[PDB]
């Protein structure tokens, strides 16, 4: 019923893939409005 963006998105993002770095190519259109899962938060993180 509820979502994550604000202070709670700037940390989970650098949690789920941590030390690879990442992008917004973007996240904030989905996880502010629709309820994302922890699959989508993987695929918006930078592939090595």
């Amino acid at each position: 019923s509820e979502t994550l963006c604000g202070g709670e998105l700037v940390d989970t993002l650098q949690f789920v893939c941590g030390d690879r770095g990442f992008y917004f190519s973007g996240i904030v259109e989905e996880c502010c409005f629709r309820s994302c899962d922890l699959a989508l938060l993987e695929t918006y993180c930078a592939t090595p």
């Binding site: 202070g7 650098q14 030390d19 904030v28």
Partner: protein, 1638 residues
């Protein structure tokens, strides 16, 4: 003319000194020479009204004040009959008709004035034309006309608010000097600061020294009074040194600044000196006003404006910008990020001008000190808001300072700043995200960034703009359709505002306001505002005074909040028949007119029944109402009360009150102004307005609230004339009642009791919660803590605090000695602490609920009034128990106790049937917690029915009587009179097992109105045993009765698990951590996010502890889940530094944070994997991989890291491979997780037949045949020598039995002692037994280390004793490892050197390296402590450190462990001085292959020699032909042949060396000595006797000489001589005949 000076609303500009008014010189030669062909360099422009006639300006056509001259003649481009105008931030001259165009366009020449203060030379250029020579646009950079006259300045700022061109110079200062070069005098100056050289009086600000004569003169003291001039930056100094003058003229000085676009800070320049007023012009980029890049971006795909206007921090800003922090790791790589939006910075010391985002770091910050230094400076404010996906706004700067991007070409830093939109308006900083390949990201949370409707340019007379933030309001809701009746002291006037009136509407112009004011004349409308107590509208009428204004009155409109659409209220009227104007002057106001906000909406009635609806405002989940609609998709109404929603994409507006969302279109329905009806027999209704659509019948929402007994959710009533009415019934709409008291006591809660709180206020209370910390005391006079820092006599009651950066203690409200019982809650108001952002006074408010004595409070959310909220659940505020123990713990399997299912705050109204007219309030053994909702059930009752008829009792509590072990075990005596009017309601409760983390209520089943009800709860709480074996963090092994205890590490201190470079995870065993919130075992980085709650039910599975936390933070997954964590413990059979909990992986299936760890606490079994073989102890201790596993490889396939092998421990964990904990052997598949193919079973078993050692593993997985779980795998071992300690390899595959083969030199058995320690060789044919050198432990010491060596002898001896089987031990450091096993001794001979090599093999591991291969310096210090081996702390894998102090240098690369074990090599050197010498220290190649030397005779000695030989049993004796002193000589061809057999030389010649066999004395060639008798080999052919003599001269390519001699049988000893010799074979022949040869 004099129309050439323009003044704006507050300031003025004049073009005065720029124009050559009647001074008769050359005019402005407004040309640069780039392209000119007719050399039409005319452009003679006086600004006001002149042309001055001279060379190329004589014969100008005047009365135009503009020349157009050429080779072809003279023209007029423009006249001056206009006035200069204002463009965006500029002054523009629209000039008039000069001469005609070719098409008669009447040529117009525009001139633009951009101001650049400190411009004496100013020549404009024609940059742009119309391309066709009849529209000439000019750009002029002048000193003139952008500002008013001078103003004095502050400390070093010229800070003026009205003119708004507010410079600053403060980065120009320098504590060193500024050095000026004339011939014989330098000039020494630091602006706004003291002179910093010793030759000068340091009271000065500037002084010049005579560099020819070294004489100081004060050119004035330092000064801070900045003096803006009109077009100039004047700075001047104090009196200083006089010369000779009778007026004693002191040397003052004057400094001027000229703007430049790209100079920077520049050098000061000696201008001149005229009469001791010293002149210094300067080019400083800081002296120049920048332009704001316009920040309004339109919408390409739809029509919606945006706004980034008010976010630019314009002024008050010396480091007063938006700033954003980063905490991360410890006292290094901290950054504080400065950034500003849409314009360059309020200048910060040592960043830049024309930069937007300064990186700026901490230095010696500890103790309220030293904010900044500057490191890296980037960005240019270039682009502006590039809009994105309908709510989110990307924003980019470019052109920063240089960097590298993974060895790519050098590019700039690049700020991106994402602006997602939200509703929480004031005081939201950016939140730092990233520093990743020179793209510094940020993330903003909130502005009013997102919702700007274009407004579709509605221009209704009822509609007026508000340019403060950006708004238009509408009074169309005052289309009041039966008219209004105004009060009037003359007579009642009648009024509507716009578009309504029939009752006075039959006149010319269709009047909506012109009524009789008798017992009249039409009035039209035009209107205006100034937003300052002022929202007005005129009423223009027809019967005007001649050449004057008609009857036109004003209505001032201000804002009330808590009132209806309103009532016009008649401020004074006054008739004036003398003057033609006549104004009624009626002025009222309503709520519905002004800026919408969060309305604080506690409100009341005249009838004294106070209300509150703010019990509903705190909803993070936005409310929803249910609907009825047609066969298509059902609509969806969102709805809130008194507080707007979070940015639903596609319903725009400012206050989104109610956003009607279907699939297709998004209708904004409402805004936020509350006025419930309170006078009726009915109740509340609250109204939302301004849909601003629907054919001038605008949308509105009025949700209607009546009181219900239960919680509810709204619904859709009907819809008419495109407004709505809903319905919504919940508890809150019942009239609430509260009472007031004093000195922390209250009274009369409708129960007749008192409320003491001063026991809680006895000592201090610290709520160590989040980023803040609150020291406060209950019932005031807070004195203790680190905050009594104040001087004023007012009392401290509460004051918050920070950590290091600007750590402040601003005091909250003062002690006011009050509390109030408000609807079952106790709360205090603490008003009046010091100031917030704007005006706001910090108030604190402390709540109380009554509970079971849990007196640790916690702070809740921050309100908009800068207030702080607090919450306790104490044991004080609830008087009337009827309590029982409500249990039977006498027998087990009985559902023994029901303690935790009681409730005291509010109570269970059951999960009833759909369509219950009744409300079943019941809790298990407590008598009705008093709900504050409505006329209550009397609290003596425990089972009660509300809904429909009266509160009636259904029974009273009694301690549990059961009927069975299982069921029907609570019963309620003495409910009310039944239809029999005999017995009272006797009601029973049943309970049943399930598993439900949030169970249901007792489900209401039966109803027989004659005194009997039953209730059966499907519970989770029925079946368990309270004597779970410990229920603290200690567990007992079911197998052998061993006790596992863990409470030696149950700290509140916590621990650190690393998941990044810049983020930690906090962790505390069987107890709550102190950093994160209470009820949290583990929590994340920046905001404290729970993973699971701390439980102590430590289970046990398979030599592993599996502690489980559950019920943590809400997970983002498709199904509603939480995080959970399994801290899985492993036996570590030592204590090392690496025993800290490493986060091992995340699982994305159900949100599971996995956790490995280690300890020695957890192994019951003493780990030994070393077994006996008759007399020989064998061991496999050094073959344990200690840091990771080993990998058994991909086999029998291609294009695939397939097995993980660990012999007698479990394997060391490794980030990102979730092989579940305590695994010996792990198969990594190509899909899904890896699999437990065995755990470590027991000691190595033998095979008594073959003597090749097995070891086995049992599993806890089923086979692929489902055959009786017990998955097996066993490893073999194979004795075979070599250096490598070897790998596993998989050979044989059964369906569920894997067999790993292994080659290792360890299982090789120790033979009987040796053959000997003796270099027995086939070639030199005589050995060197070093049994003599088997003595004792040597001590060779060289460099920073010592050594301990021993040959054919181990020495775990005098120093450490633990170098087990160590032949070469490093005694240096602490516990230096072994180099080579004494069984693995491989004695060797080196041929060309003729020296003995002693090699050892397979000791411990060569020390580890970085990933980059730059080796480590392993006696080092981290955090004061010293360590040897690669530590895990604050990074997720092992890492060494490549400096002596990680606190100093910050160099590290990850500890990638080698498989190359250590080894050693010893050399021995022939030295005649001593038989046994000393070993020496040669080399450490990456510090493992350490090699040793010797100075010996023991390996050399040919002294005791037998040169006798037997072949085929045919013996000889040759002791006769030897010559022990002297040798027989024969000298042919000039060569002297001195030789005798199996001897040294004896009384030999000059210059032939020691132990010489043959030394030839040559004539022209060098003396060579060839042949030796220790490698001498004698043999007899059929006829000849042969011998060899090696180690002579270098013949060819590693070739030597050999005297192979012929011994034919003869009768008498002869002499040999030389037959032939070649160069290919380098062989010598000798034809000897002797008697003693055969």
């Amino acid at each position: 003319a004099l129309l050439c000076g323009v003044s704006d609303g507050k300031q003025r500009f004049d073009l005065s000194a720029l124009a050559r008014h009647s001074e008769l010189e050359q005019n402005w030669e407004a040309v640069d020479g780039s392209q000119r062909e007719a050399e039409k360099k005319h452009f003679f422009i006086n600004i006001c009204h002149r042309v001055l006639q001279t060379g190329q300006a004589r014969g100008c056509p005047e009365d135009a004040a503009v020349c157009a001259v050429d080779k072809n003649g003279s023209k007029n481009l423009g006249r001056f009959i206009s006035s200069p105008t204002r463009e965006k931030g500029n002054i523009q001259l629209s000039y008039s008709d000069g001469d005609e165009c070719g098409g008669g366009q009447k040529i117009i020449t525009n001139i633009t004035l951009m101001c650049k203060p400190g411009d004496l030379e100013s020549a404009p250029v024609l940059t742009t034309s119309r391309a066709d020579g009849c529209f000439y646009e000019f750009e002029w950079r002048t000193a003139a006309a952008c500002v008013l006259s001078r103003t004095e300045g502050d400390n070093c700022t010229v800070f003026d608010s009205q003119a708004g061109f507010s410079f600053d110079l403060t980065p120009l200062t320098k504590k060193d000097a500024y050095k000026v070069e004339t011939d014989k005098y330098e000039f020494h100056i630091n602006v706004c600061g003291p002179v910093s050289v010793g030759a000068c009086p340091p009271d000065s600000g500037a002084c010049q020294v005579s560099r020819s004569d070294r004489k100081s003169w004060n050119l004035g003291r330092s000064n801070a009074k900045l003096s803006y001039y009109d077009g100039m930056i004047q700075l001047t100094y104090r009196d200083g040194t006089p010369y000779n003058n009778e007026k004693r003229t002191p040397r003052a000085t004057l400094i001027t600044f000229l703007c430049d676009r790209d100079a920077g800070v520049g050098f000061p320049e000696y201008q001149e000196e005229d009469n001791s007023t010293y002149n210094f012009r300067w080019y400083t980029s800081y002296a120049c006003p920048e332009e704001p890049l316009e920040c309004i971006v339109t919408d390409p795909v739809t029509l919606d404006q945006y706004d980034l206007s008010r976010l630019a921090k314009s002024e008050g800003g010396p480091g007063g910008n938006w700033y954003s922090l980063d905490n991360g790791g410890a006292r290094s790589t901290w950054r504080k990020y400065y950034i500003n939006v849409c314009r360059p910075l309020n200048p910060v010391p040592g960043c830049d001008r024309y930069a937007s985002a300064c990186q700026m770091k901490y230095q010696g910050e500890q103790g309220s000190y030293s904010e900044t230094v500057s490191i890296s400076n980037l960005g240019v404010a270039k682009t502006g808001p590039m809009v994105e996906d309908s709510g989110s706004l990307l924003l980019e700067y470019v052109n920063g300072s240089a960097c590298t991007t993974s060895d790519q070409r050098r590019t700039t830093y690049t700020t991106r700043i994402h602006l997602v939109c939200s509703t929480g308006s004031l005081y939201t900083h950016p939140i730092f995200s990233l520093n990743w390949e020179c793209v510094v990201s940020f993330l903003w949370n909130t502005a009013a960034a997102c919702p700007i409707r274009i407004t579709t340019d509605i221009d209704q007379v009822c509609s007026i703009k508000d340019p403060n933030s950006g708004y238009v309001f509408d009074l169309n809701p005052l289309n009041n359709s039966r008219g209004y009746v105004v009060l009037g002291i003359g007579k009642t006037f009648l009024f509507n505002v716009c578009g309504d009136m029939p009752a006075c509407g039959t006149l010319d112009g269709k009047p909506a306001s012109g009524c009789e004011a008798e017992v009249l004349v039409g009035l039209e409308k035009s209107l205006q505002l100034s937003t300052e107590g002022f929202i007005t509208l005129n009423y223009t009428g027809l019967p005007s005074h001649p050449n004057g204004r008609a009857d036109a009155f004003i209505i001032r409109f201000v804002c009330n909040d808590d009132v209806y659409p309103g009532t016009p209220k008649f401020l004074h009227q006054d008739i004036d028949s003398s003057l033609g104007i006549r104004d009624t002057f009626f002025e009222f106001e309503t709520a519905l007119a002004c800026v919408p906000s969060p309305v604080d909406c506690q409100v009341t009635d005249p009838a004294g029944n106070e209300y509150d609806l703010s019990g509903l405002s705190k909803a993070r989940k936005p409310w929803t109402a249910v609907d009825t609609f047609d066969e298509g998709k059902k609509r969806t109404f969102y709805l809130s009360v008194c507080t707007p929603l979070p940015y639903i994409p596609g319903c725009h507006g400012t206050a989104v009150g109610c956003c009607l969302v279907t699939e297709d279109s998004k209708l904004n329905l409402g805004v936020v102004q509350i006025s419930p009806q309170v006078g009726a027999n009915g109740s509340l209704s609250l109204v939302y307005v301004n849909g601003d659509k629907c054919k001038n019948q605008r949308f509105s929402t009025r949700i209607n609230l009546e009181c219900a007994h239960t919680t509810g959710s709204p619904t859709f009533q009907l819809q008419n004339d495109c407004e709505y009415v809903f319905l919504w019934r919940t508890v809150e709409a019942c009239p609430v009642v509260r009472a007031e008291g004093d000195y922390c006591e209250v009274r009369d809660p409708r129960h007749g009791n008192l409320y003491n709180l001063i026991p809680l206020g006895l000592n201090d209370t610290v709520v160590r919660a989040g980023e803040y910390t609150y020291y406060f005391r209950v019932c005031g006079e807070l004195t203790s803590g680190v905050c009594p820092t104040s001087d004023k006599s007012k009392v401290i009651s509460s004051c918050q605090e920070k950590r290091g950066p600007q750590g402040f203690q601003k005091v909250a409200g003062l002690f006011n000695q009050k509390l109030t019982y408000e609807n079952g809650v106790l709360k205090m108001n603490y008003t009046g602490g010091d100031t917030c952002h704007k005006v706001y006074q910090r108030s604190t408010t402390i709540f109380f609920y009554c509970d079971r004595s849990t007196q640790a409070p916690v702070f809740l959310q921050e309100t908009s009034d800068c207030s702080y909220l607090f919450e306790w659940r104490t044991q004080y505020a609830c008087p009337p128990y009827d309590l029982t123990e409500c249990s039977f713990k006498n027998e087990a399997g009985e559902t023994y106790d029901l303690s935790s299912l009681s409730r005291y705050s509010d109570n269970w109204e059951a999960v009833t049937g759909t369509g219950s007219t009744e409300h079943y309030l019941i809790n298990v053994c407590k008598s009705l917690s008093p709900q504050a909702g409505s006329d209550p059930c009397p609290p003596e009752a425990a089972v009660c029915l509300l809904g429909g008829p009266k509160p009636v009792n259904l029974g009273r509590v009694r301690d549990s009587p059961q009927w069975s072990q299982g069921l029907t075990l609570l019963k309620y005596v003495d409910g009310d009179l039944c239809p029999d009017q005999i017995r009272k309601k006797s009601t029973t409760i049943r309970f049943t097992c399930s598993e439900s983390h949030v169970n249901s209520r007792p489900m209401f089943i039966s109803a027989v109105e004659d005194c009997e009800y039953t209730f059966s709860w499907p519970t989770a709480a029925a079946c368990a045993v309270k004597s779970n074996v410990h229920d603290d963090c200690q567990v007992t092994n079911p197998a052998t009765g061993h006790l596992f205890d863990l409470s030696s590490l149950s700290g509140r201190a916590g621990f650190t698990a690393a998941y990044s470079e810049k983020g930690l995870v906090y962790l505390s065993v069987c107890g709550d951590n102190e950093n994160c919130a209470n009820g949290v075992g583990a929590c994340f980085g920046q905001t404290r996010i729970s993973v699971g709650k701390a439980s102590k039910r430590l289970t046990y599975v398979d030599q592993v502890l599996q502690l489980v936390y559950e019920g943590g933070s809400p997970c983002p997954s498709k199904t509603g889940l939480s995080y959970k964590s399994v801290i899985s413990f492993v036996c570590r059979p030592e204590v090392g530094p690496t025993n800290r909990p490493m986060l091992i992986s995340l699982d994305k299936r159900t949100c599971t944070l996995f956790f490995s760890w280690h300890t020695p606490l957890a192994c019951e079994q003493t780990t030994e994997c070393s077994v006996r073989n008759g007399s020989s102890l064998i061991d496999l201790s050094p073959l344990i991989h200690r840091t990771g596993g080993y990998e058994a490889y991909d086999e029998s396939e291609d294009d695939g890291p397939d097995f993980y092998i660990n012999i007698c421990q479990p394997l060391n964990p490794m980030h990102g491979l979730a092989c579940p904990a305590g695994t010996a052997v792990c198969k990594v598949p190509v899909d899904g997780p890896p699999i437990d193919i065995g755990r470590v079973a027991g000691p190595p078993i033998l095979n008594p037949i073959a003597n090749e050692v097995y070891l086995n593993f049992e599993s806890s997985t089923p086979c692929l045949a489902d055959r009786h779980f017990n998955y097996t795998s066993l490893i073999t071992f194979h004795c075979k020598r070599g250096v490598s300690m070897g790998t596993p390899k998989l050979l044989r595959t059964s369906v569920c039995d894997f067999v790993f083969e292994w080659e290792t030199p360890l299982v090789c058995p120790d033979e009987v002692k040796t053959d000997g320690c003796s270099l027995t060789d086939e070639q030199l044919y005589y050995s060197f037994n070093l049994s003599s050198l088997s003595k004792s432990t040597f001590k060779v010491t060289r460099g920073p280390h010592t050594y301990s060596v021993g040959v054919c002898t181990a020495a775990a001896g005098l120093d450490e004793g633990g170098c087990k089987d160590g032949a070469v031990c490093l005694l240096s450091g602490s516990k230096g490892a072994s180099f080579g096993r004494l069984a693995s001794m491989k004695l060797d001979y080196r041929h060309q050197d003729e020296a003995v090599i002693l090699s050892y093999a397979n000791g411990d591991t060569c020390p580890p390296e970085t990933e980059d291969g730059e080796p480590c310096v392993f006696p080092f210090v981290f955090n004061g402590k010293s360590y040897e081996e690669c530590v895990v702390e604050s990074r997720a894998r092992l890492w060494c450190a490549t400096t002596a102090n990680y606190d100093r240098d910050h160099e590290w690369g990850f500890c990638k462990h080698s498989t190359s074990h250590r080894t050693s090599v010893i050399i021995f050197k022939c030295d005649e001085d001593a038989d046994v010498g000393r070993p020496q220290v040669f080399s450490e190649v990456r510090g493992c292959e350490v090699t040793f030397e010797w100075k010996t005779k023991v390996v050399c000695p040919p002294k005791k020699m037998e040169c006798k030989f037997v072949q085929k049993h045919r013996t000889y004796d040759l002791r006769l032909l030897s010559s022990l002193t002297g040798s027989w000589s024969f000298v042919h061809n000039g060569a002297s042949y001195y030789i005798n057999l199996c001897q040294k030389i004896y009384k030999g010649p000059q210059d032939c060396s020691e132990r010489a066999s043959v030394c030839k004395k040559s004539t022209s060639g060098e003396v060579q000595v060839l042949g030796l008798v220790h490698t001498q080999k004698l043999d007899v052919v059929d006829d000849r006797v042969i011998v060899t003599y090696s180690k002579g001269h270098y013949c060819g390519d590693n070739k030597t000489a050999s005297a192979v001699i012929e011994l034919t049988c003869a009768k008498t000893v002869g002499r040999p001589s030389f037959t032939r010799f070649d160069v290919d074979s380098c062989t010598y022949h000798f034809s000897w005949d002797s008697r003693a040869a055969c």
